[PDB]
Amino acid sequence: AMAISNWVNVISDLKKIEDLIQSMHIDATLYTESDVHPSCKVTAMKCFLLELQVISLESGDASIHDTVENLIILANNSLSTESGCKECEELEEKNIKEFLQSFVHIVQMFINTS
Amino acid sequence: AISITCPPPMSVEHADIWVKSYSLYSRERYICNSGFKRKAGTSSLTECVLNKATNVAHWTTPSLKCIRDPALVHQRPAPPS
């Protein structure tokens, strides 16, 4: 075993969730920060994690839920601050494609390992 | 095994809903009222489902909480009550 940021495994779960939702018809719009400021990346990560739970609840699918659960545990293992940041509900609502693309963008900021 | 349909949805505080279909398995969505926003992490989806013991159907209770728009909590300050 060698040491690799947990966030690498988060991207692998996002890829998996994206693949799994492709069959289904999940049509929630979700709060999306597509341009995270480094000074607010914890606040932004927290929003992504919250909204990810909506994808799971609305899917009603065991595998999506397991994969969301695995992601959130990894991410919380990687967290635990910041000021002047937007609340989640101030963010644009975007479709699931755009949401997940932006999720990948920010997970990538945290591999640095920022 | 009849033409099972759901009754009107229950009210959600600070939300309204316009049902396109009352048929079994129909998926509908509450929408937060003007100046309110879906709380992050909560879902506005409600589904018509079957009490498969009694053959009546009901709308699932959404996890939706509509909260005051943070844009306005900050930029349009106001009393409570």
For A58, the closest of B40, B43, B70 (CB atoms) is: B43
Give the best residue of A45, A47, A87, A94 to mutate against chain B (max B CB count within 10 A): A87
Number of domains in chain A: 1
- By CB atoms closer than 10 A (0-12, 13-18, 19+), residue B34 is exposed
Question: How was this entry determined?
Answer: X-ray
What are the residues facing B14 on neighbouring strands? none
The helix (H) or strand (E) run that includes residue A101 is helix A96-110
How far apart, in Å, do the first and last CA atoms of chain A sit? 22
Full domain range(s) for residue B43: 22-81
User: What Å resolution does this PDB entry report?
Assistant: 1.9
Q: Is residue B17 part of a domain?
A: no
Which whole-number Å values give the CA distances from B70 to A91, B15, B38, B67, in the listed order? 10, 16, 11, 8
Q: Are A50 and B41 inside 8 Å of each other by CB?
A: yes
Q: How many domains does chain B have?
A: 1
Ramachandran angles phi, psi of B31, nearest 5°: -125, 135
Sign of the alpha-carbon torsion through A60, B12, B28, A15: negative
Radius of gyration of chain B (CA): 16
- For A27, the domain range is 1-114
Rounded CA gap, A73 and A20, in Å?
Answer: 19
Supply the DSSP symbol for B35: T
Which residues have C-beta within 8 Å of that of residue A101, sequence separation ≥ 6? none
The vertex-B4 CA angle with B3 and B7, nearest 5°, equals: 130
Dihedral sign for Cα atoms in the order A104, A52, B50, B30: negative
**B32 belongs to a structural domain:** yes
Whichever domain contains B31, its CATH number is 2.20.28.230
Q: Does A98 contact chain B (CB < 8 Å)?
A: no
> Would B9 be classed as within a structural domain?
no
CATH number, domain of A88, equals 1.20.1250.70
Domain assignment of residue B2, yes or no: no
Q: Quote the strand ranges of chain B, DSSP E.
A: 15-17, 27-32, 36-38, 45-51, 56-59, 66-68
What would the two tokens of residue B51 be? 């009490």
For residue A47, the chain B residue with the least C-alpha distance is: B40
